Design a binder for this molecule. Structure first.
Ligand SMILES: CCCCCCCCCCCCCCCCCC(=O)OC[C@H](COP(=O)([O-])OCC[N+](C)(C)C)OC(=O)CCCCCCCCCCCCCCCCC
Ligand SMILES: CCCCCCCCCCCCCCCCCC(=O)OC[C@H](COP(=O)([O-])OCC[N+](C)(C)C)OC(=O)CCCCCCCCCCCCCCCCC
Ligand SMILES: CCCCCCCCCCCCCCCCCC(=O)OC[C@H](COP(=O)([O-])OCC[N+](C)(C)C)OC(=O)CCCCCCCCCCCCCCCCC
Ligand SMILES: CCCCCCCCCCCCCCCCCC(=O)OC[C@H](COP(=O)([O-])OCC[N+](C)(C)C)OC(=O)CCCCCCCCCCCCCCCCC
Ligand SMILES: CCCCCCCCCCCCCCCCCC(=O)OC[C@H](COP(=O)([O-])OCC[N+](C)(C)C)OC(=O)CCCCCCCCCCCCCCCCC
Ligand SMILES: CCCCCCCCCCCCCCCCCC(=O)OC[C@H](COP(=O)([O-])OCC[N+](C)(C)C)OC(=O)CCCCCCCCCCCCCCCCC
Ligand code: SF4
Ligand code: SF4
Ligand code: SF4
Lengths: 115, 85, 209, 176, 155, 115
């Protein structure tokens, strides 16, 4: 109840500020004012053209790494069990393989951006 | 479909009928662009340049140099595309 | 050299530079047309415009020269000459601590060979000459205007180009863009005639016609 | 003579290697830079409280142009037109005619202050100390036309700024 | 009375605009160094609320600090047009004010007032940092005298 | 004496080949130019203007001069194609603001002293 009410207020306040911004001020619209900016010279193309990604491999590696925090985040709760020896072995196993994943990518020049 | 000698002439004359500088019934397959229709060279470049778009193949300047008649254009297109009916 | 106000003379350089001029003329007779050394000790080699690459390459690479740096490359417009444009190459030799000037000529329509193969510095210098004087350098990587505005017609540094040009720019609200119009000046440039009617330097007196 | 700016090789003893490792891991040199910015924070700022405080100037300062007078009140200018001839910007326009008393005086003396480069050549060329670049620099305008100065404007500036102008000349005329 | 309200509201909107003038990071030549010196410790334009921002969209003032050539002129109008209103232009130096010492050149616009409107002209070559500051403060006073809402009430 | 170094063409026939080739490139490029620069003219208007510029010099008979005019044209093509130019530069060929100037004796006589 209180969370939803707080979220509504926080975003509503922002929207009111934007509405004030677009309506209170005096406006004078003409084609050149509303033109794309490229330091005073008209753009020589479209911003919607392909923009090459030189860190594509690191980006994909992020998805795999970003999951294993979900596997590792429960560890504070897991350290609360009575079968600690099995845990500690498995917790360190999971972290150590993430290190092995990092090393293989690192040593195979996967962390270097393409030209 | 495979191009025909008659078909090429039909499409070639079709383009030139659309050229605002050429009078349609004055246009003939044996009509010289210079001596008869009264067109200049820059116009001839435009005309050939339209055929390239029409038939989707490029005619070099040495060969487009000489095509001063619709029939000559038709023959050149036929020669490149191997049309003999 | 005890005259307080008069520039000292260095004859050692004059003898050295003069000999090197004889050295170049002997080695490159096919192109060298004149060699002169000035009172303030600077050597100038004057060549046929067909020896630009041979002469420049020799000066760059010969072991008794090694002019590895192209300090400047420019042009001068002299309308009275039938070949109005004088192309000047100024070169620096770090090995021998020396400078040499190479001069050649061309006209409005005759091209000069690009020196980019010899010095990669010449790329922009040659573009400037084309833009400002209208001299065409053949076999240039990319010859295009460098200093003048896009679409500017004319070659400003020619002596026959008006100082204020032929067109001027302003913003027109009707078309909502900057437009070019013929030049009208609120105050015309005032041409001052400063030359004195009395000769100043006898040593340069030109022989009577 | 020459010196090498970056041609030193490091020491490979363990103490040196360890010290560099600490620098790498504990960011010592970066912390060092933070100290300098901290020292400057406790230094007095160099700011002056303009317009209540002004930046220092010298008697030679080249500012707003003025036309001067002899102590009698007579204009110093004699229309020699040396200022017009030396002006690198062609900013000065002068027309002269004989005055009703036969004196060589100007009917026009116009300076386009949007052509001027404030070089002071016109006060060097003047043989009678008539045209001077004064001390003032606070004459910004809301329009271009207000910066096209005529003879009356330049004379009013002289009568406006004469006390300061004369004193500065007294200080620097021995260097000139 | 509504003539009192608009007057005080007009004072507020003028006070905010003159107390937060954001110049576009835009210079052309050797009047720009003296603009840097107005941003430097001795004069500190920041203490007046004057903050340099690169984008035209986040700018209130264009200070034309240098010689406007013909190649450059279209670009200057573009960034000006891209500035949201209200916008003001300060012309700094002889070259921008009227072409100055290149006034008779084929490649020079004989004043920036041909391309864009100008509110303040700062004379000099270069104007001193103190003289530019006098011009900025003079622009502030010009805004203080604006009567946009008083005119609206009487419109 | 008349023996002179050429630029590219050795005869007017070889030069007129380059003029025609240049007209082809310009004729293809007007449709893109109108679209890219967002001009308010028609493609026919632009292609007419190209014809006018090529017609102005329709009297020359020197191979070297024609080569230079072709060189200058090709430079203007690189500028327009690569959008080095701007809308103000492309529209300067059309002289829109210049009000028509009188071209008869009486009209010149009424206005001023010029020939
Ligand atoms: C959904 C909630 C947010 C929607 C509005 C977001 C916004 O402020 O942009 C306005 C957008 C931006 O488009 P805009 O730029 O045309 O803004 C309107 C321009 N004038 C002022 C000239 C009319 O406009 C709208 O979508 C209209 C939203 C109406 C909001 C109610 C306004 C009543 C007056 C107070
Ligand atoms: C449509 C209904 C007719 C009445 C509209 C009207 O009263 O005009 C309001 C006008 C009509 O459209 P407008 O485009 O003239 O509004 C902007 C006018 N200025 C810039 C002068 C303020 O728009 C408004 O909403 C008034 C501005 C409100 C700003 C504060 C928003 C608080 C939420
Ligand atoms: C004792 C029982 C067993 C337990 C032992 C536990 C381990 C203890 C020993 C571990 C040492 C770890 C050292 C710290 C981590 C090292 C970080 C590192 O990798 O640095 C290398 C990196 C990289 O340095 P580099 O220059 O060498 O980078 C190249 C790296 N090589 C050559 C290897 C390829 O350094 C930095 O992180 C620079 C950061 C720049 C941003 C700095 C901003 C200023 C910050 C200043 C304030 C800092 C204080 C903040 C305090 C906050 C308070 C809330
Ligand atoms: C108002 C507030 C006033 C009080 C502010 C408190 C002091 C703030 C920092 C002052 C900076 C002083 C700079 C300095 O002394 O460093 C010199 C020195 C300079 O080092 P160096 O890089 O030049 O080389 C010397 C070191 N050896 C010999 C190894 C090469 O830096 C230090 O040694 C300080 C090390 C501190 C490390 C702190 C990082 C660890 C943070 C852990 C979390 C906490
Ligand atoms: C913030 C949230 C959004 C806004 C909410 C609504 C507004 C609340 C903030 C109000 C700020 C008031 C600022 C007062 C201005 C001031 O400090 O005066 C100094 C100025 C100082 O003068 P000065 O500007 O010439 O200073 C020149 C610089 N010196 C002094 C160093 C040489 O006083 C004035 O000159 C008068 C300015 C106008 C006074 C303010 C008018 C509006 C007051 C009523 C507003 C409500 C109307 C409804
Ligand atoms: C987070 C912080 C939020 C802070 C929000 C700001 C709070 C203080 C706002 C004070 C009032 C600002 C009014 C701005 C209106 C624009 C202006 O400057 O006036 C120009 C214009 C001038 O109007 P005009 O009709 O005379 O001329 C404009 C038309 N042209 C361009 C053709 C000349 O003001 C108006 O159009 C009407 C303004 C009415 C009074 C102010 C708005 C009242 C409506 C409130 C909703
Ligand atoms: S200061 Fe220099 S530029 Fe200015 S008016 Fe005097 S001579 Fe001319
Ligand atoms: S140099 Fe001095 S006296 Fe001569 S015209 Fe100029 S201001 Fe007058
Ligand atoms: S007005 Fe003066 S400081 Fe500014 S660009 Fe021109 S010469 Fe330089």
């Amino acid at each position: 109840m209180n969370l939803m009410l707080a979220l509504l207020t926080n975003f509503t306040l922002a929207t009111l500020l934007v509405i004030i911004a677009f309506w209170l001020p005096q406006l004078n619209v003409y084609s050149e004012k509303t033109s794309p900016y490229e330091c005073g010279f008209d753009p020589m193309g479209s911003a919607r053209l392909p923009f090459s990604m030189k860190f594509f491999l690191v980006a994909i590696t992020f998805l795999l790494f970003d999951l294993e925090i979900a596997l590792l985040l429960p560890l504070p709760w897991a350290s609360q069990t009575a079968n600690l020896n099995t845990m500690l072995t498995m917790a360190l196993f999971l972290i150590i393989l993430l290190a092995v994943s990092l090393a293989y990518e690192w040593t195979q020049k996967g962390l270097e951006w393409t030209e | 479909p495979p191009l025909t000698l008659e078909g090429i002439k039909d499409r070639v004359l079709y383009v030139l009928k659309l050229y605002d500088k050429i009078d349609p019934e004055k246009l003939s397959v044996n009509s010289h662009f210079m001596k008869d229709l009264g067109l200049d060279s820059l116009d001839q470049v435009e005309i050939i340049m339209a055929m390239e778009d029409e038939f989707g193949f490029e005619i070099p300047d040495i060969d487009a140099e000489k095509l001063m008649c619709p029939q000559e254009i038709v023959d050149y297109i036929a020669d490149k595309k191997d049309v003999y009916e | 050299d005890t005259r307080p106000t008069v520039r000292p003379r260095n004859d050692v350089a004059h003898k050295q530079l003069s000999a090197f001029g004889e050295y170049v003329a002997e080695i490159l007779p096919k192109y060298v047309q004149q060699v002169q050394v000035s009172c303030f000790n600077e050597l100038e080699i004057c060549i046929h415009p067909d020896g630009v690459i041979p002469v420049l390459t020799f000066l760059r690479d010969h072991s008794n020269a090694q002019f590895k740096s192209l300090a400047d490359l420019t042009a001068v417009d002299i309308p009275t000459r039938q070949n109005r444009f004088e192309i000047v190459y100024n070169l620096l030799s770090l090995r021998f601590n020396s400078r040499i000037r190479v001069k050649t000529y061309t006209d409005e329509l005759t091209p000069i060979e690009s020196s980019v193969p010899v010095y990669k510095a010449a790329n922009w210098y040659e573009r400037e000459i084309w833009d400002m004087f209208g001299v065409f350098f053949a076999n240039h990587p990319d010859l295009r205007r460098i200093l003048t505005d896009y679409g500017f017609e004319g070659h400003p540094f020619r002596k026959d180009f008006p100082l204020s040009g032929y067109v001027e720019l302003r913003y027109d609200d009707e078309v909502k863009r900057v437009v070019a119009e013929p030049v009208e000046l609120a105050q015309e440039f005032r041409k001052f005639d400063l030359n004195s009617p009395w000769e100043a330097f006898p040593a340069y007196r030109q022989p009577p016609e | 003579t020459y010196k090498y700016v970056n041609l030193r090789e490091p020491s490979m003893d363990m103490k040196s290697v360890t010290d560099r490792a600490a620098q790498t891991l504990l960011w010592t040199e970066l912390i060092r830079g933070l100290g300098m910015t901290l020292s400057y924070l406790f230094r007095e700022p160099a700011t002056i409280n303009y317009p209540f405080e002004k930046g220092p100037l010298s008697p030679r300062f080249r500012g707003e142009h003025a036309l001067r007078r002899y102590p009698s009140g007579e204009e110093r200018c004699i229309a020699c037109k040396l200022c017009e001839a030396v002006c690198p910007a062609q900013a000065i326009t002068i027309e002269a005619e004989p005055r009703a008393d036969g004196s060589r005086r100007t009917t026009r003396y116009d300076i386009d202050m949007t052509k001027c480069i404030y070089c002071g050549f016109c006060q060097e060329a003047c043989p009678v100390d008539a045209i001077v670049e004064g001390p003032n620099f606070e004459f910004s305008t809301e329009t271009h036309e207000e910066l096209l100065y005529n003879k009356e404007k330049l004379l009013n500036n002289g009568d406006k700024w004469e006390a300061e102008i004369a004193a500065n000349i007294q200080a620097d005329y021995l260097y000139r | 009375r509504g003539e009192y309200v608009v007057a005080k509201l007009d004072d507020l909107i003028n006070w905010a605009r003159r107390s937060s003038l954001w110049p576009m990071t835009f210079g052309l030549a050797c009047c720009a160094v003296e603009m840097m010196h107005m941003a430097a410790p001795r004069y500190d334009m920041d203490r007046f609320g004057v903050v340099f921002r690169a984008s035209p969209r986040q700018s209130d003032v264009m200070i034309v600090a240098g010689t406007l050539t013909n190649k450059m002129a279209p670009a200057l109008r573009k960034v000006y047009d891209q500035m949201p209103e209200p916008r003001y232009v300060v012309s700094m130096g002889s070259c921008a004010n009227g072409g100055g010492y290149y006034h008779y050149s084929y490649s020079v616009v004989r004043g920036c007032d041909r391309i864009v409107p100008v509110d303040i002209y700062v004379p000099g070559c270069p104007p001193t940092a103190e003289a530019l500051l006098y011009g900025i403060l003079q622009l502030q006073k010009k805004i203080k005298r604006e009567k946009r809402l008083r005119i609206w009430y009487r419109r | 004496s008349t023996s002179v170094k050429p630029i590219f063409s050795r005869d007017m026939n070889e030069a007129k080949r380059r003029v025609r080739e240049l007209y082809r490139a310009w004729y293809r490029e007007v449709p893109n130019t109108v679209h890219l620069f967002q001009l308010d003219i028609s493609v026919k208007q632009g292609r007419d203007k190209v014809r006018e510029m090529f017609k102005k010099n329709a009297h020359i008979t020197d191979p070297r001069v024609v080569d230079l005019l072709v060189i200058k044209g090709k430079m203007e093509l690189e500028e327009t194609i690569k959008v080095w130019k701007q809308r103000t530069h492309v529209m300067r060929f059309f002289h829109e603001t210049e009000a028509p100037r009188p071209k008869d004796f009486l009209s010149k006589f009424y206005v001023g002293h010029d020939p």
